[PDB]
Design a protein around this ligand. Structure first.
Ligand SMILES: *C(=O)N1C[C@H](NOS(=O)(=O)O)CC[C@H]1C(N)=O
Length: 250
């Protein structure tokens, strides 16, 4: 366990980072207090909800659809019968809400318990209805479910090292749709962003969670901001993460 200083990559934004290589148990931690603090996963939960949907047969492949009903949305790309791969990349809320509402709560509870997914608290299934967004809400979006960045990395590692009961076929689908292009062919990066605002504490929850493969070694990582500036989003934290990866993990 090495405590490290990634502050220059954060360019003044409050946050922390954790990178873990489970082969040689090398844990690299920037801002330990934050890395151990549980927060809503927001859209990073789509990593797990994709696997839940595949395991339960709600979806079956990166092509699978959820029966778009014509509802109007401001994001152009939500207004179509999009595939799993597209819904993941566009973070399409209606697709993932419809997916998860086909699964019984006991099944979700037991999968989260098996994964040790933070507090595993799905008590507020409907989500944070006081924000007015109605059915665009759920337990994983600034609501009952909370997970720390360290726990995110532990979950990512358990999934992608083959240590869960999820089918290998399904984990490979998730790998495919999480892959990102960082304009460096010598590292394979995979991940997912998330963005929320913590009304109680007046701070963002901005995430980039995933893994890095670099010639033999694999690092599971979570980058998290808790800045008070509402301009700090998941995509901004992904930029910070990529800067860290290129500086220290190339
Ligand atoms: C998930 O965090 N969300 C869904 C969507 N994607 O956000 S992301 O670009 O950070 O991945 C919009 C924000 C958020 C939400 N409001 O539900």
């Amino acid at each position: 366990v090495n405590i490290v200083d990634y502050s220059d990559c954060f360019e003044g934004i409050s946050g922390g980072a954790i990178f873990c290589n489970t082969k040689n148990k090398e844990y690299n931690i920037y801002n330990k207090e934050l890395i151990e603090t549980r927060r809503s996963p927001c859209s990073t939960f789509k990593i797990v909800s994709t696997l839940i949907g595949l395991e339960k047969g709600v979806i079956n492949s990166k092509e699978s659809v959820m029966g778009y009903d014509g509802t109007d949305y401001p994001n152009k790309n939500w207004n179509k019968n999009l595939s799993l791969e597209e819904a993941f990349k566009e973070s399409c809320v209606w697709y993932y809400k419809k997916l998860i509402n086909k699964v019984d709560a006991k099944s979700v509870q037991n999968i989260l318990d098996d994964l040790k997914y933070g507090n595993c608290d799905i008590s507020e299934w409907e989500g944070d209805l006081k924000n007015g967004k109605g059915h665009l809400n759920g337990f994983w979006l600034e609501s009952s479910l909370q997970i720390s960045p360290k726990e995110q990395v532990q979950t990512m590692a358990k999934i992608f090292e083959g240590d869960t009961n999820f089918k290998k076929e399904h984990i490979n689908i998730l790998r495919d749709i999480m892959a990102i292009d960082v304009n460096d062919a010598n590292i394979n990066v995979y991940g997912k962003t998330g963005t929320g605002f913590d009304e109680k504490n007046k701070r963002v929850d901005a995430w980039f969670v995933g893994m890095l493969e670099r010639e033999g070694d694999t690092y599971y990582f979570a980058i998290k901001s808790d800045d008070s500036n509402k301009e700090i989003t998941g995509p901004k934290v992904k930029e910070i993460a990529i800067n860290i990866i290129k500086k220290y993990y190339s």
